[PDB]
Every structure is written in C-alpha cells, then in structure tokens.
Write a protein that binds this ligand. Structure first.
Ligand SMILES: [Mg+2]
Ligand SMILES: [Mg+2]
Ligand SMILES: [Mg+2]
Ligand SMILES: [Mg+2]
Ligand SMILES: [Mg+2]
Ligand SMILES: [Mg+2]
Ligand SMILES: [Mg+2]
Ligand SMILES: [Mg+2]
Ligand SMILES: [Mg+2]
Ligand SMILES: [Mg+2]
Ligand SMILES: [Mg+2]
Ligand SMILES: [Mg+2]
Ligand SMILES: [Mg+2]
Ligand SMILES: [Mg+2]
Ligand SMILES: [Mg+2]
Ligand SMILES: [Mg+2]
Ligand SMILES: [Mg+2]
Ligand SMILES: [Mg+2]
Ligand SMILES: [Mg+2]
Ligand SMILES: [Mg+2]
Ligand SMILES: [Mg+2]
Ligand SMILES: [Mg+2]
Ligand SMILES: [Mg+2]
Lengths: 77, 149
RNA sequence: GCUUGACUGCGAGCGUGACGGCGCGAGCAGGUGCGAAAGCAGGUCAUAGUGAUCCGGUGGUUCUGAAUGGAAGGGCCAUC
RNA sequence: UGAGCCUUGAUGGAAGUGUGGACGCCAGUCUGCAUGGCUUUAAUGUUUGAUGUUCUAACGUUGACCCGUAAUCCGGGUUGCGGACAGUGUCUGGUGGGUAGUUUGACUGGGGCGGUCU
RNA sequence: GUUUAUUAAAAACACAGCACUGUGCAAACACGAAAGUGGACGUAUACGGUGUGACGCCUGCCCGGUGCCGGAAGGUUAAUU
RNA sequence: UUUUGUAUAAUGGGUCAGCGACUUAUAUUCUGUAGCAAGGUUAACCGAAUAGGGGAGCCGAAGGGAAACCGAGUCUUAACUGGGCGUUAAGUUGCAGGGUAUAGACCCGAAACCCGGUGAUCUAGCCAUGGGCAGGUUGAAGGUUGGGUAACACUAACUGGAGGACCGAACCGACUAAUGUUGAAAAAUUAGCGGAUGACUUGUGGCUGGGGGUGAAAGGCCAAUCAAACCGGGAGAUAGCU
RNA sequence: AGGGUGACAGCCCCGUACACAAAAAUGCACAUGCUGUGAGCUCGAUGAGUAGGGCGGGACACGUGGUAUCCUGUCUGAAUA
RNA sequence: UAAGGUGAUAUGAACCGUUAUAACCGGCGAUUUCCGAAUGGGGAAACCCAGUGUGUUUCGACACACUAUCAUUAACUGAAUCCAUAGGUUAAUGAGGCGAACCGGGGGAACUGAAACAUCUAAGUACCCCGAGGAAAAGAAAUCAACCGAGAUUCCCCCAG
C-alpha cells in the first residue's frame, strides 16, 4: 500500500504550484524498494517494504531492534 | 559506516579493525556473509579489551618464563665433565642437549632448545661460559665443568 | 561680450476642472549672474511634445527598528 | 585520463671516450643508463571527478525445477540469465490542445469591414 | 452491406485491394494511481496507426516552411556542486 | 407595464376565493426623543436574575507632524516670515426611524459549473448458449467417360453441387405518395418499396457508466432525455436583464 | 396551574399546594470487600536518523517577502547541561 | 392497584372476575418461527442444500443443537532443508453490523466574488472516507514576557476590523 513499513511513511498530498503560482494537487510518495534483509540472529532472510532513509534506520538502530518493533505493533515480517 | 572488520576483506582486512566503508558494501556483503560488524561501541568502546587482553595483558602479567636469566644463574655448579683422554683431551663433546640438560637445579627440567653458543664447543675443559639462551631477548647464562673421568 | 535664474525654500491672490489635477502669480528669505545704474533673470513668443497607483531599484537622513545595541526592513527627501 | 595534495626531481667514492630525453638569442648547452687511476613544471602514493571494462552481492527475471499444494495467482527455497544496469522516489530541462480553466475592447446612423481611441 | 431510433439512405461510412509507418515480445499500443488485463495462449507471411478505396493504364516537379528520421563536432543550456 | 409616445393591431390577466414580494441579525452614520454631562457607559460574568454588583473596556474633553517629538499649538524651512492643519466646538448611552456595510438582503427566473450516487428491462458494441429462413432459378471448382497429347495443355457430354448469386413469403428493413397532425398512434395506417444462407435474423443471460461507454462515423445511441444521461446535494449559484 | 362536565364553575369530576410510598431494577456519588495496579524513601537516569540544514510543498492573519516559528516527500545530519 | 374486565375500526357471541393477583400499571424473568453483520455452504432477502452429533425411538431416523472470517493466546501437528520456520487442526476469548447531532483524523470541489480572469476568493466550506466518546479534542512550557514579571489546556468578553 506504498507505506514505508518501517517508519510508516505514507504518501502525503500537496500542490504543484507551477510558475505564476497555479494550484494543482500532486501528492508526494515515499521511496521504498522492498529490501532483502539478513536478520542473522533469526537465521532468516526476511524482506521488508523498507524505504530510503528508513533503511538508514535499520543500519542505525538494529535489524533486530527494528524487527523488535514492527512485530511489536503487530505487523507482518 | 565503520564496522569492525572480521577477516581479510581485500583492500581492507585485519580480522578486527574499524574502517569507513560504503553502507552498500556492508548490509550487502561485508556483513550478511560473515566479514564485519557495525561499530556500535558494544563491539569496540566495550569490546576493545579483546585487543587489550594480550600484548597489553597476556604480555605483562604473563609472569611465567620472563625471569629466565634471573631464575637461572645461581645454580648448584653445573658440572659436565665431557670426559677426556689421550694426552689430556676429551672423550665427550659439548652440544645443545647436554648443556641445557645438566643445568637442572632441584630435579628441575630445562629444554635443550635454550642454548647460547655461536659454534660448537670444541673439546677443551677450561671455563665454559655456556649461557642459557631461552627466550629471544630474555636469555640466561650458565656454566659447565668439563674435564675427565 | 559675459554667464548658468533651466537657482533652493515659500507664496498675497487668482484662473480652470466632478474629482485626481492643471495653469497664472506680485511679493518674502537664502544665495547667484548680467548691467555704471534703474533693473532683468524661478528656461525657451505663448498654446502640443504625455502616464495616475502599486511594486520595486539608487543616493541621502542619527525619523523608526518587536527584550537591549546594532542590523534587515519601514518612513521621509531626491530620483529611475 | 583531468584536478588536487605533497613525496621525490631541475629550475631559480674522480676526470675523461657512446646513448636518450630538454628546449633553446646557440652557434649553446642541461640532465638520467659503460669503461675507465615556495612557486613554472614531472614519476610515487594518495584523494577525487570522467568515461570504459570486469565481477556479485543488492535489484530484475512474463527461464527451469522443489515445497507450501492433487494451484495457472502468491510465498519460500534451488538453479540459470541479466546486474549496479534496468526500474522507482524527490528534484530538474524539453515536449505536451491529450486534458483543463479562461481571454479574445468600445464608438459604429443595425453588426461586420474600414476608420477612430491621448 | 452501413448510417442521422422520430424530416437527410446518399455522391456519405464500410469494404476486398494498395501504400506509408511503428512494433524483437515483459511488442508496439490500449484499460488501469497499482496489481493486473486486452494485444495473443498470437510472435514480423504477426499485431497496431494512418491515408487511399474493386479492377485497368498510371501516380510528374518542389525538402525552401512544418512535422518526422539520422548526426551532434561545436555554440546556448536545468537541477546540482 | 414599458415608453419620446399606446384605444393601441406592443406586454400581462378566462373569473372567483385563499396565499404572494423591502425582512432579520450584528455594525456604522445621521434625524427625532429620553437619561446624565466635561463627563457618558458598561462587556462577560456574579446574581438575593429584567434588580443590584462588575467600569475589563469604548466614546468625548487636543491638536500638528511621516514619525521622534512637541502641544494650544504644531508642521513646513536656515528661517524671524509667511502658508497648511488646529485653538473662543458638548459629549455620551439607550429607544424609534432614514441610509450604508456583511449576509440569500425586495420576490419569482436561467443557460450552466462542481461533488456523490442510480441506470446497457430502450439503444450501440461485444461475450456465452439456443431458435429461424414457404416455394422457384442459376449452375462454379472438383470428378467420370470419349476424343486429344510423347506426356501434359486442351475439348466435349454427363456427374457435381458453389455463391456477402437470381425471383419471392415468413422474417429483418424503411425509398415513395396519400391519410392522419386536439391521431387509432408522443412516427402509425394503407398502396407500392429494399434484403431475404448472410458483414443475416432472433430468444435468453452476461460485460462496457458520464467528460465515461459504444459508434461500418450521424455527434449517432447510452430507458419517448444527449455538443456531455438521470437522481440527490453545493444551492436561495450568478442574473448591470425581463 | 390546568383539563372535563349539555352556555363562562376555586366549593360536580380529574387534578392542584402539601405530605407520603418500592418486591425488585438500575444512573450517579460516597463507603468498603475480591482481583489488578502500586504508594513512599535513597541513590540514579532524564527521550538521535533527532535538533538544525539543502530542494519541493504545506500550516501559521502573514500570498517568500527582509520572513521568524511549526509539519514534513526527498537528500543530509550535531551538541548532549 | 382494583370492581370491573377479554387493545382499535367493533359491535355480537362465548366467557373471566366484585376481598385477596379478573383486568390494568411497573420491576425482573420464560418463550422469542424465518430474512437481515447473518456467521454450516449457497441464494434473485423472508428460500435451497449438507456434515458431525445428542437424547429419545416402532430404535428406519426424527427434529433439535454445533460447524463463517479474521485477530490474540495455548496445545498438538508440521514442507522445500538437520534443526527451524512456513503451512495445518483444535480450544478460549474479542471483532464484525446498526446508528440524529456534536468530535478527531485521511482526501477534498465549483458556482461565486475580484463588476472580465489566471495570483487571490468562495473554503479547508460542500462532499466522500476512517475512528472514538458521552463528550471529543486539548493539557502541565525547549510558553509568554521584557530586565518587572506571569505561569497547563479549554470556553466567554475585551484588545480590534
Ligand atoms: Mg515657441
Ligand atoms: Mg480548450
Ligand atoms: Mg470559472
Ligand atoms: Mg460594439
Ligand atoms: Mg445496396
Ligand atoms: Mg428516410
Ligand atoms: Mg475517400
Ligand atoms: Mg475516389
Ligand atoms: Mg504524388
Ligand atoms: Mg419605441
Ligand atoms: Mg392590448
Ligand atoms: Mg385574489
Ligand atoms: Mg442474395
Ligand atoms: Mg407496407
Ligand atoms: Mg428477395
Ligand atoms: Mg439482451
Ligand atoms: Mg433516446
Ligand atoms: Mg454556495
Ligand atoms: Mg435562483
Ligand atoms: Mg445461513
Ligand atoms: Mg452467507
Ligand atoms: Mg467574476
Ligand atoms: Mg526572573
């Protein structure tokens, strides 16, 4: 459903605001690329709908600290 | 992305060393494949003792075979008469075994692999300054009293 | 021939416009030029040769400037 | 292969008799390979951009199998192919009646044309 | 053959035929924010688009303008730095 | 009623009865009237609720300047002049009215625009599965036999049975005229007319939904509606016009 | 107060003020029992892909304006009393 | 509570009660077919079809009861692959659907006004969607203030068109 999945970054809406300042709803959407992660500890190759930056999170907090959450809120994975 | 290395890793390996590398190289290869691990302190700022539990620990408190020259230098006269004969010469020669052998204090035991002698002690009998060269820079000194029978 | 009155600040009082404006103006203060002097000069003999407001640009100013000192920005005067 | 850097060069243990490279006010000479009583600028490492290759390990596969499963979807696994490409997100130049919203003056002896507008 | 159900049946549309052009297959293209689907369980003797409109004899000259195709060496040039 | 002007052959009204259009809220300014007066007056709220309390606050008694500032003066300017605006003004708060502002703003009225739903029982395409076409005519390809050839061509009879083939009912359609035109009928009747084994015709069910569909292309059809359907909503759209 | 009664009623009727009433069921207050929670005291700690930043939008009365502050799709990214 | 009663158009019939549950009023319960979230599967709503059982039975079988999906947990099972997961079965709970306004959030017009129209307006309105409560939301300063100080949020009047 085009959701960051790891940081719940959904696609927000906005205006194109062309020159002359002309309104036109456009809506911005996250990056996402569904990556293949190696939990290692769980010895499984889990894959998530992770999105840019949100990927920097995993590499910052923990592939297990992340999966710690996610599974906490009751998400898939 | 630093991560402490865990092996050879071509242009950057030390079986344990931090090095700035692209996260694309990690979390894709230098990791998930057993070759490194993120520098999360818990593996360095806390797991640095592994690098300080030898050269800095098992190299200082390693008290055991460091006091060689000291432990051995006041023996009970290492008399090793390498025999003699024929106009006052010798029947036995001096080598690596006999030397670091008779040099035993109280029924102790010394490996003959710890001798300090350039060449081979030609057959004589006079003062034989047989130093007990054990460790590299940590060797000792002993003697031998060759004569006859 | 000599010069910069095509000056600065004001202006009794009038004309002409629905208004925004526009025009005429003696005389007053400061300072100029020409003339011996009285005096004349605030552009051209007069009536066309033109663009409001906004938004800004440039110079000046101890007017203002959000805790205070500055500053940005704003006002004011000159001006594009 | 461009640019950094500074590392090593010219700038500014003895002769003498071959050979490259440097360009010159030259008629110079400069400097590296036998036998012999700080800038102006270049190799080394390095950093970094520019393409061009190769690799696998992300990523793709509407190839082939296995299992879920007496399934054509889907998921996991194995293998092959492709491979940091493709594709997508944000930003950005071009294109864009495909679509959308509008504008397209007045006087005028009817309107239009012509002319006019201070 | 088709068409303006309810004023137009036609010289209009359609057609077989012709020509141009796109498309190498996860085709072009089209419906769809997407997944997916038609094209086609087809694969250039195939599919889409456009114009001409059996058949016969034919289909001349112009590439300056516009579009499209190729080149891109150089001039101008976005974000970015 | 609208007009320079209407008996006007210019508009509206068959008649009657009932209903039908300058409102309301807050604000601001005058006029009248009442209260108090260099002062007038409270808001919310409290409340022994129309009291009383509450003066937060608003207006006025001071103005000039762009302002700092100054002050019955102050700006302008170097400025003494002068000139502009002020100073020998009573205001304030209710109540009723005239006017304006914001609102639907006197009342009725568009053609349209936007949002969400309902519609392929009509019709246009298509998909699945069933049905229909009296009668009569033509006579292709192929084959057989004779001839013919070196063998094929070729030829002739017979056989054969093709075709968006022919004539013509059912069936589908719709070229002509009359009649109908407050019809029998919101497209028909009557006499002729076109196709009638085909791009045919029909039953049943299904799929395309509105800026969307469908279209052998007329802007045609999408429920007697179509250069953007119907229903509900924005909504009392707006209407310098009648 | 009000309504009815064969015309308009305090005194006909039902009411009316006033005063009473609950087997049971429950709203809400207190009060307590069961479960859960956990008070209090010492010494600690004191919220990072975050705050800021560049690009695009959006919200602040404030239409990028000299424009603070807030949210963020996208790329980054600190101090830590 | 009571001398009257068996609701209405509704009389009549046939009855019940005049003391103490006749009727009637209120509290709590029993029954409560079929459709409808509809939940055994299906289905053109109020109908069609099934599995496993229970007890009773002439013991044919009867009707009746349970059997949807998902979520959490528990237990037992269990692929590619040792393990392990994925998947499977069961059970216990909870959800589902209705709803008038108010409330929070996601998405979001145009007519209109600007006497034209793009910025702007209408308006974050109409409308669609999701969620929750009796209220919602918000809320104990990285708040204002101005060198004096104030002290969460929310609502009213002023400040001020
Ligand atoms: Mg002249
Ligand atoms: Mg257009
Ligand atoms: Mg419009
Ligand atoms: Mg005109
Ligand atoms: Mg025909
Ligand atoms: Mg016709
Ligand atoms: Mg033609
Ligand atoms: Mg032709
Ligand atoms: Mg030609
Ligand atoms: Mg007239
Ligand atoms: Mg008349
Ligand atoms: Mg009347
Ligand atoms: Mg025929
Ligand atoms: Mg007929
Ligand atoms: Mg016929
Ligand atoms: Mg049908
Ligand atoms: Mg119709
Ligand atoms: Mg409206
Ligand atoms: Mg109207
Ligand atoms: Mg059922
Ligand atoms: Mg069901
Ligand atoms: Mg307008
Ligand atoms: Mg303080």
């Amino acid at each position: 459903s085009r959701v960051c999945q790891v940081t719940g970054k959904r696609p927000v809406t906005g205006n194109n605001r062309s020159h002359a300042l002309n309104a036109t709803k456009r809506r911005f959407l996250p990056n996402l690329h569904s990556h293949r992660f190696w939990v290692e500890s769980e010895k499984r190759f889990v894959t998530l709908r992770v999105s840019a930056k949100g990927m920097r999170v995993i590499d910052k907090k923990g592939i297990d600290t992340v999966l710690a959450e996610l599974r906490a809120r009751g998400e898939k994975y | 992305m630093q991560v402490i290395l865990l092996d050879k890793v071509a242009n950057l390996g030390s079986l344990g060393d931090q090095v700035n590398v692209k996260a694309g190289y990690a979390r894709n290869f230098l990791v998930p494949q057993g070759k490194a691990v993120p520098a999360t302190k818990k593996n360095i700022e806390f797991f640095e003792a592994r690098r300080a539990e030898l050269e800095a620990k098992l190299a200082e408190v390693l008290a055991a075979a460091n006091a060689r020259a000291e432990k051995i230098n006041a023996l009970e006269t290492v008399t090793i008469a390498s025999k003699a004969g024929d106009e006052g010469k010798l029947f036995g020669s001096i080598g690596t075994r006999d030397i670091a052998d008779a040099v035993t204090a109280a029924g102790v035991e010394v490996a003959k692999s710890e001798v300090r002698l350039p060449n081979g002690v030609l057959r004589t009998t006079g003062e034989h300054e047989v130093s007990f060269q054990v460790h590299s820079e940590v060797f000792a000194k002993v003697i031998v009293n060759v004569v006859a029978e």
